[PDB]
Amino acid sequence: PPQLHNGLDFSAKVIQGSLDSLPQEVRKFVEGNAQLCQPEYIHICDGSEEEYGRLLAHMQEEGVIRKLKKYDNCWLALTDPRDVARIESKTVIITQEQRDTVPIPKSGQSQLGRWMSEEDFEKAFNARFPGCMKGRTMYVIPFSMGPLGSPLAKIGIELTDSPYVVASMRIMTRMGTSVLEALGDGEFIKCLHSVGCPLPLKKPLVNNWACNPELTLIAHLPDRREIISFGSGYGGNSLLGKKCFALRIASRLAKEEGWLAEHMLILGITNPEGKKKYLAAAFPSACGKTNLAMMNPTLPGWKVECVGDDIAWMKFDAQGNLRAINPENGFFGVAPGTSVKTNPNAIKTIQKNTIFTNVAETSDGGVYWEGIDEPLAPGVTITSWKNKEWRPQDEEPCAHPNSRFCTPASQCPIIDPAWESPEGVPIEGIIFGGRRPAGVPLVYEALSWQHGVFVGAAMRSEGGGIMHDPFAMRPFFGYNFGKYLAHWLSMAHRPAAKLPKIFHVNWFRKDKNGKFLWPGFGENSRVLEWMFGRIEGEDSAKLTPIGYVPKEDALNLKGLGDVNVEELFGISKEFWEKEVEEIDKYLEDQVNADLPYEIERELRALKQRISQM
Numbered sequence: 001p002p003q004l005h006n007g008l009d010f011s012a013k014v015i016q017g018s019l020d021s022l023p024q025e026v027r028k029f030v031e032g033n034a035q036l037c038q039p040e041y042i043h044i045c046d047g048s049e050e051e052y053g054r055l056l057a058h059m060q061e062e063g064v065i066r067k068l069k070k071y072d073n074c075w076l077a078l079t080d081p082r083d084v085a086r087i088e089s090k091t092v093i094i095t096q097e098q099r100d101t102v103p104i105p106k107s108g109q110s111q112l113g114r115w116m117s118e119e120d121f122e123k124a125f126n127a128r129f130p131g132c133m134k135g136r137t138m139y140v141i142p143f144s145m146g147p148l149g150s151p152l153a154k155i156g157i158e159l160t161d162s163p164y165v166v167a168s169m170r171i172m173t174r175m176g177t178s179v180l181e182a183l184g185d186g187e188f189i190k191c192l193h194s195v196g197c198p199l200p201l202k203k204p205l206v207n208n209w210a211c212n213p214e215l216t217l218i219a220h221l222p223d224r225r226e227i228i229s230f231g232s233g234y235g236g237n238s239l240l241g242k243k244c245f246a247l248r249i250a251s252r253l254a255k256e257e258g259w260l261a262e263h264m265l266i267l268g269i270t271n272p273e274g275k276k277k278y279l280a281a282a283f284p285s286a287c288g289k290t291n292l293a294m295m296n297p298t299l300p301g302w303k304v305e306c307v308g309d310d311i312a313w314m315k316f317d318a319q320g321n322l323r324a325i326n327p328e329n330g331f332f333g334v335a336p337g338t339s340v341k342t343n344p345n346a347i348k349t350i351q352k353n354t355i356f357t358n359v360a361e362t363s364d365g366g367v368y369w370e371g372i373d374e375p376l377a378p379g380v381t382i383t384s385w386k387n388k389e390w391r392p393q394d395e396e397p398c399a400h401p402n403s404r405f406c407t408p409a410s411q412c413p414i415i416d417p418a419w420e421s422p423e424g425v426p427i428e429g430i431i432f433g434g435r436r437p438a439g440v441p442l443v444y445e446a447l448s449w450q451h452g453v454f455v456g457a458a459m460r461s462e463g464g465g466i467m468h469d470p471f472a473m474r475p476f477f478g479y480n481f482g483k484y485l486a487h488w489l490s491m492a493h494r495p496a497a498k499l500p501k502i503f504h505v506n507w508f509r510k511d512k513n514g515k516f517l518w519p520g521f522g523e524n525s526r527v528l529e530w531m532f533g534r535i536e537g538e539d540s541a542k543l544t545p546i547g548y549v550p551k552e553d554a555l556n557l558k559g560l561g562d563v564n565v566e567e568l569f570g571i572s573k574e575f576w577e578k579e580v581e582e583i584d585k586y587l588e589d590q591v592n593a594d595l596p597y598e599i600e601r602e603l604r605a606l607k608q609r610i611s612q613m
């Protein structure tokens with residue numbers, strides 16, 4: 001016998017599946033962490049519908065989720081108000097050298113990542129994980145990021161003590177036995193998560209939502225291929241496939257292996273002639289990726305189909321096409337502001353088999369939030385996400401501003417037919433953008449690849465003041481941002497690369513009274529039409545210091561005669577002088593010695609073009 005007692009064999013505690021079925025290295029990961037965390041039960045997830053039903057029943061019976069009786073198999077979770085978002089301040093990457101993770105900021109305060117030494121992390125880990133799952137179930141989630149068996153896909157194993165995480169990972173990833181079978185004895189990303197509330201509880205449970213805010217820590221150890229997250233049950237902190245794996249770990253793998261992992265939606269757009277192109281777009285959180293990805297275009301004869309709304313993995317193929325896959329299996333979308341007006345296709349997707357977090361509940365068992373733009377019958381009342389009765393005049397919102405739906409992608413009425421194609425879809429344009437209330441026009445086109453990478457690098461967006469969010473990746477870089485820029489720039493030297501056209505948009509320009517100048521949403525189809533024609537080489541552009549913009553009369557504005565074209569499309573020398581001044585200060589402070597020469601040159605070129613105004 002291979003042990004003197006019972007070794008580290010946790011077979012007696014298995015209530016779903018079999019440890020003997022697991023690949024050897026998967027079993028080692030499970031049993032080592034069972035020894036450390038001391039769960040009462042081990043559940044090896046199979047991904048089946050039967051399992052899912054029982055899981056939802058268990059949570060319902062425990063009071064963790066409530067059934068939304070108005071819809072088909074939809075559910076509501078309300079969280080502790082201390083645990084409502086992905087939390088940057090508690091998110092770290094561990095490497096031997098700090099500079100490999102983040103450039104060293106001249107000011108002593110980096111905006112581009114948060115490094116922790118190996119030594120500090122081991123102390124943090126030992127103060128958190130030993131015994132952390134006592135009295136709970138450790139679920140073993142075998143999951144694939146990307147279509148099962150795609151050459152671009154990567155497998156992880158997430159251990160969690162949260163059945164909410166299991167349910168949500170079933171929606172947001174491909175998970176279950178088929179993944180273990182595809183994995184065999186291959187490599188996998190090791191993902192460990194605990195809510196950090198072992199039984200018996202040391203502190204009061206709030207809203208039946210286990211979390212440990214004081215000890216919350218979301219850590220990434222790329223040199224060990226591990227993600228280790230403690231204390232939050234929410235979104236990007238707990239669903240470890242999404243941001244932690246498919247952006248932070250994957251972006252570093254991508255840099256080493258020649259591909260890209262990005263905070264980008266992917267859509268397919270077809271014109272009235274039946275010609276189709278795929279585009280990717282990087283906008284920061286809260287800047288409308290999900291609305292664009294699922295757009296219902298207002299222009300007649302156009303169609304938009306959704307490949308993904310949040311994450312893109314992209315790699316040049318043998319023919320030079322930049323191919324993109326969506327590594328996710330669902331949409332984890334912001335609920336407030338979602339309406340028939342702003343996202344009709346989301347409304348259709350989320351009425352069955354969807355989990356809602358921190359939205360309001362109507363007395364007939366439906367969902368509600370700010371911006372839903374659907375009146376309720378007189379007499380129908382609303383319970384806020386704080387589990388209190390609520391009325392529209394109340395000071396606070398009925399839904400948390402970061403409340404979410406979690407919905408299967410296959411349910412989207414406009415899901416693209418190649419959304420699971422293993423080879424990915426060929427990207428012909430990349431769009432950058434965010435919230436700029438002044439100075440930045442509706443749409444411009446970069447002059448070259450290098451200018452385009454600079455445009456991504458210089459991105460800024462209003463969220464508690466205008467802040468830099470390069471490539472929409474500020475919270476997500478897996479490694480030094482200067483080296484990420486060098487990696488993007490290097491794509492130009494790939495022989496026979498078919499480099500996408502790069503554009504920058506601004507849906508959010510305001511006039512002097514604070515009013516949006518552009519109606520947006522489905523009307524953004526008019527901007528996509530312009531991009532499409534530009535990729536086709538149409539002579540529809542005017543050169544400006546910032547890049548190309550639409551010629552007068554180039555955009556279809558039929559139906560929008562009240563648009564202030566002068567102000568929306570205006571470029572001010574003084575605004576742009578200040579903009580280059582600010583970008584210079586930011587790059588010098590935050591990137592400094594790690595800034596590639598080509599980014600410095602593009603900054604100088606932009607400065608020089610502005611000088612000629």
Ligand SMILES: Nc1nc2c(ncn2[C@@H]2O[C@H](COP(=O)(O)OP(=O)(O)OP(=O)(O)O)[C@@H](O)[C@H]2O)c(=O)[nH]1
Binds near residue numbers: 287289309337524
């Ligand atoms: N004015 C205007 N607002 C828009 C447009 N598109 C989206 N929005 C606003 O963008 C917000 C919704 O975007 P989110 O779903 O939070 O953004 P996201 O990029 O999907 O964010 P994550 O899922 O967190 O990555 C709401 O405030 C919308 O009103 C548009 O065309 N015009």
Ligand SMILES: O=C(O)C(=O)CS(=O)(=O)O
Binds near residue numbers: 086234235236242310
């Ligand atoms: O913050 C984002 O960009 C999100 O998509 C939500 S979360 O997955 O980070 O929670």
Ligand SMILES: [Mn+2]
Binds near residue numbers: 289290309310332333
């Ligand atoms: Mn989104």
Ligand SMILES: [Mn+2]
Binds near residue numbers: 263285310
């Ligand atoms: Mn996102």
Ligand code: NA
Binds near residue numbers: 063207208
């Ligand atoms: Na709750």
